[PDB]
């Protein structure tokens, strides 16, 4: 679920303020997107979006409101390391991994303040 | 999910051995069932089954393999007290409550050893 994804981010990046730092960044770190990502971080976000898209297109999965962010799963944090519980069902596991890969991707991507709250209408 | 339900049981009943104690008991504490419950505990189990039935019959919900036991939710245990996370989606919340009510029902129902591993074919 969305709240768990923000927690995953705090896990991989202790000092982070998920909502404030990674929302409304570049072209894809936020709701939907357009154009091409402006940098690694922005691409991490595009990949997360694409991952959610692949999940919605799974015949075997049906998310409430057709929004994967509503799908709650089980995961655990241990010293910056994120672990998706093997007991999550196939759909939950898929979402858990999308979030986990995104959280990790965020922790290794440069954070360019100039790309924060970017004028998407022009540069995306 | 099924594994979370067993944890809920340990929460409400510290000494319990969920699988060993509450599986294959009476007419409803196990897979499916038949007849009328033999006692309070057995009825707690029938109610849990009926609760899962109501969940499967929700137009808004679609569980993997159409089995609510695969639906993973978020909950927390604190001194025998079980709490279902308000952030679970409607379907997850419904399942979480079914499990929670069952766990609590189990903790307050007499445990009749004579009803353990009962000859269902005859008494159910
Ligand atoms: Ca996005
Ligand atoms: Ca049953
Ligand atoms: Ca779930
Ligand atoms: Cl976020
Ligand atoms: Cl059980």
UniProtKB/Swiss-Prot annotation, chains A, B:
One of its GO terms (biological process) is neutrophil mediated immunity. Its main location: secreted. Regulated by bile acid salts. Up-regulated by cholate and down-regulated by taurochenodeoxycholate. It is found in: Secreted. Its EC number is 3.1.1.4. Ca(2+) binds at residues 28, 30, 32, 49. The active site is at residues 48, 99. It catalyses: a 1,2-diacyl-sn-glycero-3-phosphocholine + H2O = a 1-acyl-sn-glycero-3-phosphocholine + a fatty acid + H(+); 1,2-ditetradecanoyl-sn-glycero-3-phosphocholine + H2O = 2-tetradecanoyl-sn-glycero-3-phosphocholine + tetradecanoate + H(+); 1,2-dihexadecanoyl-sn-glycero-3-phosphocholine + H2O = 1-hexadecanoyl-sn-glycero-3-phosphocholine + hexadecanoate + H(+); 1-hexadecanoyl-2-(9Z-octadecenoyl)-sn-glycero-3-phosphocholine + H2O = 1-hexadecanoyl-sn-glycero-3-phosphocholine + (9Z)-octadecenoate + H(+). A lipid is attached at residue 56 (N6-palmitoyl lysine). Acylation causes dimerization. Disulfide bonds join 11-77, 27-124, 29-45, 44-105, 51-98, 61-91, 84-96. Binds 1 Ca(2+) ion per subunit. Its cofactor is Ca(2+). GO terms for molecular function: bile acid binding; calcium ion binding; calcium-dependent phospholipase A2 activity; phospholipase A2 activity; phospholipid binding; signaling receptor binding. GO terms for cellular component: cell surface; extracellular region. Keywords: Autocatalytic cleavage, Calcium, Disulfide bond, Hydrolase, Lipid metabolism, Lipoprotein, Metal-binding, Palmitate, Phospholipid metabolism, Pyrrolidone carboxylic acid, Secreted, Signal, Zymogen. It comes from the Eukaryota. Monomer or homodimer. Loss of activity upon alkylation of His-48 with p-bromo phenacyl bromide; Ca(2+) and Ba(2+) protect against inactivation. Belongs to the phospholipase A2 family. Secretory calcium-dependent phospholipase A2 that primarily targets dietary phospholipids in the intestinal tract. Hydrolyzes the ester bond of the fatty acyl group attached at sn-2 position of phospholipids (phospholipase A2 activity) with preference for phosphatidylethanolamines and phosphatidylglycerols over phosphatidylcholines. May play a role in the biosynthesis of N-acyl ethanolamines that regulate energy metabolism and inflammation in the intestinal tract. This is Phospholipase A2, major isoenzyme.
């Amino acid at each position: 679920a969305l709240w768990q994804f923000r927690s995953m981010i705090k896990c991989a990046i202790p000092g982070s303020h998920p909502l404030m730092d990674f929302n409304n960044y570049g072209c894809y770190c936020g709701l939907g997107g357009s154009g091409t990502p402006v940098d690694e971080l922005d691409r991490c976000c595009e990949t997360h979006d694409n991952c959610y898209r692949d999940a919605k297109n799974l015949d075997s999965c049906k998310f409430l409101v057709d929004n994967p962010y509503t799908e709650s799963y089980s995961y655990s944090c241990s010293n910056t390391e994120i672990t998706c519980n093997s007991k999550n069902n196939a759909c939950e596991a898929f979402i858990c991994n999308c979030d986990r890969n995104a959280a990790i991707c965020f922790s290794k991507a440069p954070y360019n303040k100039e790309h924060k709250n970017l004028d998407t209408k022009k540069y995306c």
